[PDB]
Design a protein around this ligand. Structure first.
Ligand SMILES: Nc1ccn([C@@H]2O[C@H](COP(=O)(O)O)[C@@H](O)[C@H]2O)c(=O)n1
Ligand SMILES: Nc1ccn([C@@H]2O[C@H](COP(=O)(O)O)[C@@H](O)[C@H]2O)c(=O)n1
Lengths: 157, 153
């Protein structure tokens, strides 16, 4: 029941400078979430896959425009803010919250996140999904997406 | 040049609070204070969390901080911020709020340090001017010109 999702998360910090690409492992976490949605026929926008995991980077101007456009187009925004913080994902969190996009933020359990990320709870249309592994995310994500989509339009601060 | 009514000043906060004392260092408070005074002495109202929260001694809750910052950014004529090295998580959220609402922005980038693609990419896709700097005096000398240019659009 979800037409499209934008999936965000750390990119630069995950690129191995020796290889110019994200590891198999980091690619796998994003790929699990991408396939989770795509298997239901949902369109998934994701820069990491788009840019061949770091091998075919866009220019900063192109990356920025395309990401904003894809977030605007998508029904829901799902993202890992990152530990340490992903600068681009944090910009994206600002774009999405500022435009009233339904959001699911994937936060590592027992890690500290920014005041301006956790403070979005109850003030933007956001659900926080704390996780201790990728399987937990896969198990809980559909419920969280459905809830924030169900709230789209409810007034928020 | 356009009249400048108000500025929201952002930058690293958590990473600058000395865990030994619970407050920002003198040197760090001074950077923000100089920029605040720069604007206020020129008739411009300044919104700034660092001063508001007593340099770390009087933090707001995450919810209050988030709401107040978003509201003050929405209110302000221009957004001026240090994205930080290393990146300030909250300032990057604020950069997203400001760019997303089409706010005139001046981003203060340390010269010869690397910043994010989605920050430098704003230079051409949003109403932003990047001001690279090697010291506080350079920022103070160049800020009015940068503000005038973004406010003019
Ligand atoms: N080359 C890049 C770098 C970041 N980004 C966007 O910003 C986020 C990652 O930011 P970082 O590289 O700063 O961690 C991703 O969610 C992605 O959408 C991008 O689309 N292309
Ligand atoms: N307690 C806090 C923490 C962050 N912030 C906002 O976010 C930025 C700082 O983010 P960090 O603390 O993540 O570096 C500032 O520009 C400030 O406006 C705040 O207003 N109050």
């Amino acid at each position: 029941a979800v037409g499209s999702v934008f999936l965000g998360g750390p990119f630069r910090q995950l690129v191995d400078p020796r290889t110019g690409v994200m590891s198999s492992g980091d690619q796998n976490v994003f790929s699990r979430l991408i396939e989770h949605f795509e298997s239901r026929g949902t369109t998934v926008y994701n820069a990491h896959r788009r840019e061949a995991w770091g091998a075919e980077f866009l220019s900063p101007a192109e990356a920025t425009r395309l990401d904003h456009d894809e977030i605007k187009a998508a029904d829901v925004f799902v993202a890992f803010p990152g530990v340490p913080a992903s600068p681009g994902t944090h910009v994206e969190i600002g774009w999405a919250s500022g435009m009233g996009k339904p959001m699911v933020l994937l936060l590592e359990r027992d890690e500290d996140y920014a005041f301006l990320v956790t403070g979005l709870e109850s003030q933007a249309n956001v659900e926080i999904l704390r996780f201790s592994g990728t399987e937990e995310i896969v198990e809980r994500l559909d419920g969280a997406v459905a809830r924030v989509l169900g709230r789209a339009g409810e007034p928020t601060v």
